[PDB]
Design a protein around this nucleic acid. Structure first.
Lengths: 46, 77, 13, 102, 93, 63
RNA sequence: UAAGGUGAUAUGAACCGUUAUAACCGGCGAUUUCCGAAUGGGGAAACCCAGUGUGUUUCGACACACUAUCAUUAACUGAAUCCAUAGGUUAAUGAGGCGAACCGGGGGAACUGAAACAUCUAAGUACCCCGAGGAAAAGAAAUCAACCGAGAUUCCCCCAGUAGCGGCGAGCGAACGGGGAGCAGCCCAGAGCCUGAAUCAGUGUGUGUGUUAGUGGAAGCGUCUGGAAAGGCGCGCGAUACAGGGUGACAGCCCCGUACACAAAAAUGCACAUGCUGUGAGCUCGAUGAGUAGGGCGGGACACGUGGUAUCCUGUCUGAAUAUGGGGGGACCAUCCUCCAAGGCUAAAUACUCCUGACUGACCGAUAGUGAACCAGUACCGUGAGGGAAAGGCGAAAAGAAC
RNA sequence: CGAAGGUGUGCUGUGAGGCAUGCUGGAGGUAUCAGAAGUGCGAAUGCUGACAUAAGUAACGAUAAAGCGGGUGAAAAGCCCGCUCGCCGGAAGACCAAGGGUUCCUGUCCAACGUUAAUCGGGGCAGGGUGAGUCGACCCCUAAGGCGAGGCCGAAAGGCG
């Protein structure tokens, strides 16, 4: 039974990585929101 | 954008009312056109995206005067 | 804590 | 601006043995002082295989609140307070009740 | 020019272990700790000057710090770099 | 040990820094690692001394 | 300031200092790795790879600096055609990103209410976007009023659930006028006479005050109970200090504080006087904002849903007079009254608290109060946006139980 | 020479309650008269924590299978050694990539974890271990595709190139 999550570091970084968020303004707002909440992990860091 | 380079006219949102007074959002667009104006001061043609009202404004005033105002506005033509 | 160096080490087949 | 210092002979106002005289050895940042033969604690020191093997029960000194000890006058035969005054440009301590310099 | 002071900081400490001892007595090589960057050229120059010995080649590797479970808390040790330095026929230390 | 070396020329300041880094900083570090160092307070004292010399160099050279 | 110290969990080891450069606190400086607007190029963030210019141990190889984009300005170059322009290079100046609310503008719902529902309401609300400030916006009548008069804007209490609007349903809802807070008026569209002539902005000096370290700061003893008294009993003293906190049970007089009186080498905000720089006083004459006002068509805003609908704004098509002129006074006309649009600047009363200090509470006291009193936005869950806990209490003192 | 709270007892009022006291408790409580409420719980397939029931019941995760001797140990069917037996053998063997991130090796310990015991372990604690001019990454080149100086377009954001 193949499950939904099939890990891949390259796909994870290129999809939800820090640079991916900064590319668009919506991603920048995502980072801004999580800085405000004080989350330790801003994004998925390798 | 659909902005006249002389009068600054830009699209403005509004309503359109039917017989039953139903209101739906619409948008009014300026009558923009691309026109080439001959300028004797610089001896060449300048292309401006101007509305019909703006073209009347250019005729009433001078093309040189309008260009000076555009330059003072700070936007390249 | 987080390790960030998943470099490839392919031993010759 | 500490009224009780390294080398002072003091007396105890309140505690297990009030009225007992002694001399302070050290003062803690938490307003506590250590004196000889005043607050003795029979600590059960565990044995250790290191260089030191104290073993048995050690009679240590337990720190006491600085507020519970007052510097002794040594002339009037009673405890007395401490005040600060400037003399020849230097701040010095003095007693009260016929105050003299320390 | 800060080459002299740089060479005085790349070397951190010698490494002591069974592998270190057998390597020294057999291969005439010393294993020691270096700075995180510590390029091979810098290590080679530092050993030549500070220890006044002749060296043949240097091999470096990076050791990842272990994850330790101290008290109620989880911690990690710092990564460090150790270098194997192969001395020539003439060895001093 | 702060104003003693304030009046020396830049040449000596660089010289004293080099021997501070060379000896009592590298040698002490090797001693401590090997376990032959019992007076570990020298390490911090030497490090602060190196900082003092560097502070003088900056306020001497250039600005 | 100082006889103590080397931050905490957290003891130890090795040491510094004790009359002054131990430590600690404050001002001004120095250092300030890498990522991030990231800005030399690239990139899977904390990584990879460079060019040019300055100086150096074996050529080896090193150290530093510069090198993003955009806008403006200046210089040098420079096409299709002579000139020219576009374009290119160089140097300088400014911007970039982040931040809780408040402010202005550009867009703009639905649920819901109407006991259904389409006009309407919800509502110019939520939300998205842009720009600036410590406030912002607005602001010196082409305004009201009533033919009696007031004279910028803004905010609060009335007028008033009134007049009106409205499938005249649900609902929406003024103004005039009055009482208060605070008050400040100017400049260009231009010439002449007189030319620092007041007021402003930027840089020095001096006084005062405040912030950033601090200093002194009064006065209690004896017996009883008790593990220990600050309690009971008896007799005293201080108070421009019984506000608080701590101390072995409840302290004005044990400690830190408190009222009170003082303190600044250095950096700073505020109110004044005195210098410099730059625009700029006062009088005469003239001028006095045109594709605009207004109109037709379609919409929006004014309580006012096109209705008899004034007034304002605008997409589209037209289009005056210019002071012997024009606007408004709620369809409209005449007479009267009032004002002078089509160019701008302007603090005060007003809105909010991410943050700093003090103080307060018929606010909570660990299932409460912030999600978080315990290193919580953590553990943990989710690919991701995101969601999101539980967990406080020995004793006065570890004296934390030798054997 | 003992507050609140807790736990019993005895009186008392038509009631919700009140009063006195034994033991634990260890430092707070509050008359009377007024004032304000987060003011009273048995139910909402209520919310959170704790603890029952079924119950010492089902189950202990491929029907490839174990037996014995010796060793260590407080304790051995499961750990180590030895001799037999059985199972896989295009795999249930040996290698990688992806993905994990010290699970690798040695010493030591058996609380919890292991669906039982455990001296054993991918468990706890400590120490050790990853060596490249030739492998790979990095690097040079490019596919799909992404970004994109100027530029075109778009109320803003932004789209395309």
């Amino acid at each position: 039974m193949k499950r939904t999550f099939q890990p891949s570091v390259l796909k994870r970084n290129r999809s939800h990585g820090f640079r991916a968020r900064m590319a668009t303004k919506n991603g920048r707002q995502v980072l801004a929101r999580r800085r405000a909440k004080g989350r330790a992990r801003l994004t998925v860091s390798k | 954008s659909r902005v006249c380079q002389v009068t600054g006219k830009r699209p403005v949102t509004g309503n359109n009312r039917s017989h039953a007074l139903n209101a739906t959002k619409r948008r009014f667009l300026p009558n923009l056109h691309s026109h080439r104006f001959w300028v004797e001061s610089e001896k060449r043609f300048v292309t401006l995206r101007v509305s019909a009202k703006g073209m009347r404004v250019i005729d009433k005033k001078g093309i040189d005067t309008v260009l000076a105002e555009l330059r003072a506005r700070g936007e390249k033509y | 804590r987080p390790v960030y160096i998943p470099r490839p080490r392919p031993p010759h087949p | 601006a500490a009224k009780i210092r390294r080398d002072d002979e003091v007396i105890v106002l309140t505690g297990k043995d009030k009225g007992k005289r002694g001399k302070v050895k050290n003062v803690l940042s938490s307003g506590k002082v250590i004196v000889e033969g005043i607050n003795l604690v029979k600590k059960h020191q565990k044995p250790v295989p290191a260089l030191n093997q104290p073993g048995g029960i050690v009679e240590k000194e337990a720190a006491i609140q600085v507020s519970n000890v007052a510097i002794f006058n040594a002339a009037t035969g009673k405890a007395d307070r401490v005040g600060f005054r400037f003399e020849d440009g230097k701040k010095v301590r003095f007693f009260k009740s016929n105050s003299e310099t320390i | 020019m800060i080459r002299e002071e740089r060479l005085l900081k790349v070397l951190r400490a010698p490494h002591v272990s069974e592998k270190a001892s057998t390597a020294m007595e057999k291969s005439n090589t010393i294993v020691l700790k270096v700075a995180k960057d510590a390029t091979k050229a810098e290590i080679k120059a530092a050993v030549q000057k500070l220890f006044e010995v002749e060296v043949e080649v240097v091999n470096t590797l990076v050791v990842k710090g272990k994850v330790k479970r101290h008290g109620q808390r989880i911690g990690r040790r710092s990564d460090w770099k150790k270098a194997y330095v192969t001395l020539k026929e003439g060895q001093n230390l | 040990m702060k104003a003693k070396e304030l009046r020396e020329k830049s040449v000596e300041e660089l010289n004293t820094e080099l021997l501070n880094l060379l000896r009592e900083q590298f040698n002490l570090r090797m001693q401590a690692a090997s376990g032959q160092l019992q007076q570990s307070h020298l390490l911090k004292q030497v490090r602060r001394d190196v900082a003092r010399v560097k502070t003088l160099l900056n306020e001497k050279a250039g600005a």
